[PDB]
Symmetry: T
Subunit: 141 residues, 12 copies
């Protein structure tokens, strides 16, 4: 029923800045699309963004305690944070990793994720629709 | 309009063998689900499977000449074939890479793809629905 | 006399979550055991936990200024944070690194620590008692 | 006209602690020297320091929106933070990376920077004057 | 009840030679401290040292057959011996690895252990007290 | 008082060739700017360029014997010459390494320097002004 | 009862070409020896060779469906084919890997096998008799 | 007298597709140029292309049995196929490796060839003329 | 005629300990099977086991002087001992390396052998029968 | 019209020394063959050899200023010199790299070239004729 | 005055076996040459050989206690033994490492020594005379 | 009879500069000691030093043509020059590599030599006497 979408550092700058790498859709507009898609699927989406690791960890903690699924785009922390991975390892419901850009076509450091190995699955490079497709997966599981 | 789904080696054994790694859905059943989903989206899906690299290359050649999108699960060739990548580099329409299992949770050799860097995007670990979600992406682009 | 025990990200979830990896002892219960052991040793233990790197750095700063020893379980930051190491390099009194789990029996990324090279010593895999044994070391030095 | 000098973790401990590695000049004294040098150059320097990544990201966000140059000494985050790099990639005006110590004469992990590749240039090992020389570069460009 | 302390090559030279790296406590004096601490804990400590791998293997064999715990400082063999590890893999009671010096602050070859991954836990850099703290762990488990 | 500026292979082609990578300022013009800046600082700059390693070594030898500081842009030899480093290790006065281009944004082989570890500091990517800023450092030390 | 011997690329050239690396026994002669040895053991050997990966995969598919053991010398595909490994992972009866030459005394690329980790065991360097000894193993298991 | 030119996967798409990487000369046109050049040299050129490894191996087998020279552009198989190399190791007459593009200016995986070490020599980056120049070498040897 | 079977460290614990990794056949029982198989083959088998490298070297020395073949399972020394390899390099008669377990399915350090490159061939993972099959090879050569 | 052939260190010893690695053709004889071939092609070849890097750089400088093509066999400097590469990067006309021996069949250090990535193409292992074939390429382009 | 020459595993087989790699001089003959050379130099040479690490360690222990120089050819243990290095680190008088063969022209594993970094110096490839030249060094120091 | 001693870059600064790393013996004094030792041995020593690679190559060329032995301390070029190695490969008489300092106790880049693999043998760390001991080797061979 309830799906948590969690965005990490820099994702609040979406759409306003570089449309070429990530599209012209803003973060508020992303929230609205996610919410609408969720309703259409019979789900409720709770969308949160922070530049602060501590805050992201708290939000993951709450999803772990509530047994709720998580769609996570951790931004740069995807490649760097062991703490984020430790928090995600506690989740009993599915974890879907989402990236807007195709990280496998970019710098080598973007091609390693601490989250991919413990995630149910991973969607990258499909832009904003990535989030919407992850919702649909959760709806049919 | 027309979307080519191309499956590589061993994907014909789907469902019949190990349900634990890849699910109990067979290849014919996968074809039927794909076709039905495509119709619902206003698309036509042409689904092909081969254990032969030469055959896969021919099918990619035809999609390149027809300017048609490709959803590709190359099986083991994903990690090994430069020729498959060279053929895919000719595609002008989108290439979506799909894997049923989460390759990033398996042996290290499965975590490298010759296709990921030239693909539009990549879906892994979402099972058979991976293909269906790739169709939906193509429908809205 | 005064010993600072500093716990990093996720250590507040102790005991409540996965008992199999880290034991069924909670963080409050860990604090109580540490305090009791310290008194028995003639020491005072000040136990602090945060998911926030900035907060951990402040607590290390204060131990550096007060010339006090530190027992540090930095959680995931153990493997990732150069800033935490820079702060610890200022400590003139002993630094004992403690991990509950045996990090050397886990993923390769857990087998590298930015803290181990500048620590007096390191205890891992002895569970919660690790902290208590570190206290006893400090008491006899 | 306006130049933002941004200091990351541990840089508030300057001068007060180890003079041997980083000099006896304190952070407040660094601010005063920077301000004075800026005035002499016809610039205004806004100098900010934080141990918190989130705060550093916000300050980089504002420089990106205001089209202002940045002189950045990210401390330990220089070697570890992809998020900091993503924020800096948005800057349209020059980014000068500055380190007080010669990081290339220290541990191997200090010889890799996520920031160097996207910076205009890099000054290291010239102590506090590093900042002043970066100001002069910006003044003549 | 019975705890076997096994020391490998060069550990008989303790105290007599370099006090700076390993302390001024000799091997006989180490035996006496261990014995006294064990009695205080309600245990019996059997302390053995050899420069001969074959001898160390025999002593590990006997602990395996008697179902007794082992505290092991294998000296240089820690980093080099697969045979020692194979023998230790047979132990059903706890194995605690102990090193006097902080091996993680020394040459890179000292930072890899064939024993760490199969040990219950590892204490390094706490000097001779390392052995005593390992005894206390065994006493409370 | 006297500062030696030493340029290695290819630096005589400056300005005349590719302005895009290194600027439109020629080597003679660089000499004139350096000389003028030095006078303004109360210094004398002696600027030398050679494509010959032997010649560069002789010039470093003389600075070593005269106890004079060196500003060195060794060109390609920066990444390749152990002999140049051995000669520079004899210098008792400061060595400042300067590169016009940001070597850390270029091919991986340009990101390693045999000189950086023994230099006082390093300026890269600030163009021709790099030399001038190195002079100013020497003037205030 | 039935044992499938499967030979990959180039193995049809046996004996006719270089006797020095692989012996003077031809492929037809190998078939005859295998058949005779099998009869003596109370088994039936079905020996197949192809230069085509697709064909080898089909033959492995059939052994998987029939629950029959496989003795496999995949030739060059031993070191290169993930698809061959995926097909072999389905086998429920034993897989014995056989190579005529000692691959561990040859080029480094011959010392890695995608098949070795999932095989029951591996015989190399014992020439043609390798196949015969693998038969004998299967006969007594 | 007779020279075999063998082209691997994707080389049938020549000229028709991307002229920018490989030129606007088609495969049939390449055959005609090769034939004409061969006649002028007093040779006969037999030019074959396949996307199928098995087919390429058969053609190499025949050149081995006939003691005839081979000019080989294996396409993607150049970087991936041990089987192709094993077949080429049997050739007693010269093997010239040819690539149209300069593989050393492209992705790192194109800079390794299983064929280069056993080839007489290698021509890359000289386009279609590469084949013609290889013919001329064979004519004068 | 005479075949020396030499077993290294820990192989005396066979059968008595972990049957799951190595089988329930003991070392004395292994000796008896080897002897019986040898007689049936017209050979004499001399079977020796030691945990001492020096002893193994002496036994290899004697086989070198007597020009006798060796079947060697060096245990952990397989992966670690250059001295054992130097002794084996003197053998003029065949050396067959045997391991009970499939070392290629275990830890990465077990997948490197100092002996494999100088051995005639290698049998692994076929259990105790490995030794018997090595005898049969020697009998027919 | 004018083609510069530039030979680096040791190439003056050609033919006189080891004929087995490089052929019995001397450097003067190489010059004569090159000149004759050039005339036949309607070109003028200017052939220069030096053991001195500085001299080679000067000759490359002149070809850069005159907009003339270069055929370059840099000898050992091929694998070691960044300065030589920097000089060659200025050439606007084609650069053909030539080596007499097949460097890809020799020591691993000969398989890396600083020149290959910026060269038009590369000919190796075709002996002295390599130079002649490079001339013919330039003639038809 | 007294110089200890210590030989490790396999060195007792000298001269008797392979003269091609190590010369036809036997170990007893080596002892005699060493003794004679020592007398001529005014020294006493005590020459010891063992295949047993424990024995070598004891002999190093005695040289450490007696403050006597050591000439050490540890055989295979040169590349493998940390324990041997730990024992040698205690020596206050010079340690000269000697190898008969040129280890740098042999397998890569022979090109790493645990002893070289703590030795005064190293002589390799000069055969038996290596020992004699090491004596002469000790005589003049 | 005639022995050529060749010294590379920086060796002319001997003794005059840092006595701590290389001793207080100057280059002229080294020449005199070498000459005197040679006479005593019945040899003639010709000692040459240059900072110029070209010059060193010429001197090696002459020793190759005259069939004379070489004692070579190439300085920094030891670790960097392929050209120097190519020249030395032509020598038919012995090549002894000599270094004053123990390069194996210094930076990792000093532990690789392009010359060691083709040299007869190598002496390092025995100071100036290294040269004298190399002479004595040549005298008795
Ligand atoms: C400024 O607009 C942004 C858009 C997306 C992101 C997220 C991406 C990111 O932070 C990278 O570190 C990461 O490698 C990929 C990313 O998470 C994405 O493409 O979704 C960040 C900033
Ligand atoms: C027997 O059922 C199969 C199911 C999926 C696959 C495809 C997978 C594969 O071949 C692996 O080589 C690859 O790493 C992942 C894979 O492509 C997938 O999970 O989709 C193969 C056989
Ligand atoms: C949810 O309970 C937890 C218990 C311990 C920890 C700390 C551990 C940790 O965060 C890992 O990143 C680290 O590799 C080891 C750890 O610090 C420990 O085992 O003490 C985290 C969460
Ligand atoms: C306690 O005084 C300090 C002074 C400088 C720094 C900054 C340096 C730092 O944090 C290291 O992680 C980094 O490698 C270099 C550093 O940024 C600098 O030398 O400027 C930190 C603490
Ligand atoms: C001479 O006094 C000694 C003291 C301790 C040791 C043991 C140490 C050792 O042998 C090293 O090989 C190892 O890396 C660490 C060691 O086991 C320890 O510090 O306990 C050896 C000799
Ligand atoms: C043709 O104009 C030139 C300008 C600068 C340089 C110097 C640069 C160089 O030689 C590179 O090898 C090096 O990596 C960086 C360099 O030293 C610089 O950017 O200052 C060379 C040629
Ligand atoms: C031409 O005669 C041949 C004989 C054996 C083989 C098989 C071998 C092979 O293809 C190599 O790629 C592989 O490394 C070893 C091999 O499978 C064997 O030695 O059995 C191939 C050709
Ligand atoms: C679609 O036109 C093509 C042209 C050349 C090739 C051959 C090239 C190839 O397949 C790459 O895998 C290889 O790295 C280089 C290649 O063989 C060549 O440039 O000749 C393939 C397709
Ligand atoms: C306790 O029973 C044992 C059985 C076999 C072995 C031998 C194995 C061994 O020692 C490992 O170091 C090696 O990697 C493989 C081994 O030699 C074998 O499986 O035969 C050791 C102990
Ligand atoms: C003594 O006769 C020589 C012949 C060729 C060369 C050139 C070769 C060379 O210097 C090697 O460093 C390089 O790897 C290959 C080389 O450039 C060639 O084979 O053309 C040198 C000396
Ligand atoms: C059988 O005659 C022997 C001669 C010398 C050696 C010593 C050599 C050795 O053991 C190798 O492991 C080592 O790499 C070099 C060695 O120590 C030497 O060449 O002196 C061993 C056996
Ligand atoms: C300034 O006095 C010197 C003395 C010796 C050397 C030679 C050494 C050298 O150049 C280093 O590059 C090399 O690693 C070792 C060296 O050749 C030696 O120690 O003999 C150089 C300068």
């Amino acid at each position: 029923l309830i799906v948590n979408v969690i965005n990490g550092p820099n994702l609040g700058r979406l759409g306003r800045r570089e449309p070429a790498v990530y599209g012209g859709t803003t973060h508020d507009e992303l929230v609205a699309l996610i919410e609408r898609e969720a309703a259409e699927l019979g789900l409720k989406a709770v969308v949160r963004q922070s530049d602060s690791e501590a805050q992201l960890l708290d939000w993951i903690h709450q999803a772990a305690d509530a047994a709720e699924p998580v769609i996570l785009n951790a931004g740069g922390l995807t490649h760097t944070s062991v703490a984020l991975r430790d928090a995600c390892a506690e989740l009993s419901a599915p974890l879907i990793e989402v990236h807007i850009s195709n990280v496998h076509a970019r710098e080598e450091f973007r091609r390693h994720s601490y989250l991919s190995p413990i995630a149910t699955g991973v969607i990258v490079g499909l832009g904003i629709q990535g989030y919407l497709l992850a919702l649909r997966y959760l709806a049919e599981h």
